[PDB]
Design an enzyme around this catalytic site. Structure first.
Site, PDB file in Angstrom:
ATOM      1  N   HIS A 136      27.645   5.587 -19.909  1.00 23.27           N
ATOM      2  CA  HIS A 136      28.057   4.429 -19.139  1.00 23.27           C
ATOM      3  C   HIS A 136      27.019   4.083 -18.084  1.00 23.27           C
ATOM      4  O   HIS A 136      27.046   2.949 -17.602  1.00 23.27           O
ATOM      5  CB  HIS A 136      29.437   4.623 -18.504  1.00 23.27           C
ATOM      6  CG  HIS A 136      29.509   5.367 -17.211  1.00 23.27           C
ATOM      7  ND1 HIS A 136      29.903   6.697 -17.174  1.00 23.27           N
ATOM      8  CD2 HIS A 136      29.292   5.040 -15.918  1.00 23.27           C
ATOM      9  CE1 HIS A 136      29.897   7.138 -15.932  1.00 23.27           C
ATOM     10  NE2 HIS A 136      29.515   6.142 -15.144  1.00 23.27           N
ATOM     11  N   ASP A 192      31.176  10.126 -23.503  1.00 26.02           N
ATOM     12  CA  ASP A 192      30.368   9.496 -22.470  1.00 26.02           C
ATOM     13  C   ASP A 192      29.124  10.336 -22.205  1.00 26.02           C
ATOM     14  O   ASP A 192      29.029  11.064 -21.212  1.00 26.02           O
ATOM     15  CB  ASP A 192      31.189   9.319 -21.197  1.00 26.02           C
ATOM     16  CG  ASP A 192      30.530   8.443 -20.150  1.00 26.02           C
ATOM     17  OD1 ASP A 192      29.499   7.815 -20.484  1.00 26.02           O
ATOM     18  OD2 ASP A 192      31.033   8.361 -19.008  1.00 26.02           O
ATOM     19  N   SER A 223      28.069   9.547 -11.130  1.00 24.98           N
ATOM     20  CA  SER A 223      28.018   9.323 -12.555  1.00 24.98           C
ATOM     21  C   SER A 223      26.765   9.920 -13.193  1.00 24.98           C
ATOM     22  O   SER A 223      25.694   9.669 -12.666  1.00 24.98           O
ATOM     23  CB  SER A 223      28.013   7.816 -12.861  1.00 24.98           C
ATOM     24  OG  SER A 223      29.266   7.234 -12.580  1.00 24.98           O
TER      25      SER A 223
HETATM   26  C1  LIG Z   1      37.504   2.821 -18.033  1.00 26.05           C
HETATM   27  C2  LIG Z   1      37.433   4.193 -17.296  1.00 26.05           C
HETATM   28  C3  LIG Z   1      38.096   5.251 -18.230  1.00 26.05           C
HETATM   29  C4  LIG Z   1      37.977   4.170 -15.828  1.00 26.05           C
HETATM   30  C5  LIG Z   1      37.118   3.478 -14.719  1.00 26.05           C
HETATM   31  N1  LIG Z   1      37.808   3.584 -13.403  1.00 26.05           N
HETATM   32  C6  LIG Z   1      35.766   4.204 -14.566  1.00 26.05           C
HETATM   33  O1  LIG Z   1      35.827   5.277 -13.963  1.00 26.05           O
HETATM   34  N2  LIG Z   1      34.675   3.706 -15.021  1.00 26.05           N
HETATM   35  C7  LIG Z   1      34.746   2.344 -15.534  1.00 26.05           C
HETATM   36  C8  LIG Z   1      33.292   2.209 -15.986  1.00 26.05           C
HETATM   37  C9  LIG Z   1      32.467   3.384 -15.447  1.00 26.05           C
HETATM   38  C10 LIG Z   1      33.462   4.465 -14.957  1.00 26.05           C
HETATM   39  C11 LIG Z   1      33.093   4.876 -13.529  1.00 26.05           C
HETATM   40  O2  LIG Z   1      33.325   4.028 -12.674  1.00 26.05           O
HETATM   41  N3  LIG Z   1      32.564   6.028 -13.379  1.00 26.05           N
HETATM   42  C12 LIG Z   1      32.167   6.337 -11.990  1.00 26.05           C
HETATM   43  C13 LIG Z   1      33.118   7.405 -11.406  1.00 26.05           C
HETATM   44  C14 LIG Z   1      34.309   7.055 -10.774  1.00 26.05           C
HETATM   45  C15 LIG Z   1      35.185   8.009 -10.240  1.00 26.05           C
HETATM   46  C16 LIG Z   1      34.853   9.367 -10.338  1.00 26.05           C
HETATM   47  C17 LIG Z   1      35.781  10.429  -9.767  1.00 26.05           C
HETATM   48  N4  LIG Z   1      35.643  11.644 -10.151  1.00 26.05           N
HETATM   49  N5  LIG Z   1      36.672  10.059  -8.922  1.00 26.05           N
HETATM   50  C18 LIG Z   1      33.660   9.711 -10.971  1.00 26.05           C
HETATM   51  C19 LIG Z   1      32.792   8.759 -11.502  1.00 26.05           C
END
Ligand SMILES: CC(C)C[C@@H](N)C(=O)N1CCC[C@H]1C(=O)NCc1ccc(C(=N)N)cc1
Ligand code: NA
Ligand code: NA
Lengths: 10, 28, 251
Positions: C43, C99, C198
């Site tokens: 992603h 992912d 990420s």
């Molecule tokens: C569609 C997905 C399953 C949920 C979305 N909120 C999400 O997390 N996304 C949508 C696209 C990319 C990813 C992201 O933002 N990853 C970054 C992220 C966010 C939260 C955490 C955490 N551990 N709280 C970690 C990485």
């Protein structure tokens, strides 16, 4: 933006 | 590879970082 | 990283920063797995809902870093991408299943006190370590809160959570290619990954051979460090065959 510029070479 | 996962400034010197022991202690 | 601490120097020498060339900014974390291969989240590189689709020449890899924003002369190394490989069954449409992505470097990076690869788990290590309550460690330069940004690399240790608790914590469909980690509201302690973290690694130190293994990739979550929510991680061991296949086929 808040980042220091990297050497132009990269 | 051969030496993966052994950090020069810690495992390679037999030095522990400040919280790795918390991980060890959870591996019960 | 939310509710973490500053890393020690050399504590995560496999930590990679993915860096956007223009405008020059952090894109994601990542990990060094050998002298020319970097592991990250798919992603980070491809996410059509957000019109994200990067190519090799959009990006740089910065290795050996501590400071987020500073150019770390004589210490970090900056590498160009030769090729990106995204899992062919990465599910960007729904739940970010699979992912994971590999990046091949133009030239081999030189290892140092600050630059060293992490191990990838074999079946036995994963079976032994991927157990509810066992802690791993996540690192990154992402947000300090769910709303700022850190001056240096942050670290937090978090317990793996039982799969039914992971499942009941969200409406998203969870797969066998994911695990979740974090403290429960009752457990008191807290901490989580967040945006910017990420693609970075979830690591564990094997008590059998005292080597660090990357068990997960920071993938997704709902908010950051919310009570009753858990961070989700790509299950590296489950996708291992694809990883080796790629490295074996493209050396
Ligand atoms: C569609 C997905 C399953 C949920 C979305 N909120 C999400 O997390 N996304 C949508 C696209 C990319 C990813 C992201 O933002 N990853 C970054 C992220 C966010 C939260 C955490 C955490 N551990 N709280 C970690 C990485
Ligand atoms: Na659910
Ligand atoms: Na939480």
């Amino acid at each position: 933006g808040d980042f220091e510029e990297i050497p132009e070479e990269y | 590879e051969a030496d993966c996962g052994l950090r020069p400034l810690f495992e390679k010197k037999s030095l522990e970082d400040k919280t790795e022991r918390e991980l060890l202690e959870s591996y019960i | 990283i939310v509710e973490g601490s500053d890393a020690e120097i050399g504590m995560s020498p496999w930590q990679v920063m993915l860096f956007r060339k223009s405008p020059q900014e952090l894109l994601c974390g990542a990990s060094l797995i050998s002298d020319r291969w970097v592991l990250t989240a798919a992603h980070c590189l491809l996410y059509p809902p957000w019109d994200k689709n990067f190519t090799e020449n959009d990006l740089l890899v910065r290795i050996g870093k501590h400071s987020r924003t500073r150019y770390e002369r004589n210490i970090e190394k900056i590498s160009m991408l030769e090729k990106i490989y995204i899992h062919p069954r990465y599910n960007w449409r729904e739940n970010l299943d699979r992912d994971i992505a590999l990046m091949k470097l133009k030239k081999p990076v030189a290892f140092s006190d600050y630059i060293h690869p992490v191990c990838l788990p074999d079946r036995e290590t994963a079976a032994s370590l991927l157990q509810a309550g066992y802690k791993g460690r996540v690192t990154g330069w992402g947000n300090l809160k769910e709303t700022g940004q850190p001056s240096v690399l942050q670290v937090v240790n978090l317990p793996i959570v039982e799969r039914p608790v992971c499942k009941d914590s969200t409406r998203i469909r969870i797969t066998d290619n994911m695990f979740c980690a974090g403290y429960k509201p009752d457990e008191g302690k807290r901490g989580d990954a967040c945006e910017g973290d990420s693609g970075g690694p979830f690591v564990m130190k094997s008590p059998f051979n005292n080597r660090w293994y990357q068990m997960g990739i920071v993938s997704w979550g709902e908010g950051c460090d919310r009570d009753g929510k858990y961070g989700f991680y790509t299950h590296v061991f489950r996708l291992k065959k694809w990883i080796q296949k790629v490295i074996d086929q493209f050396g």
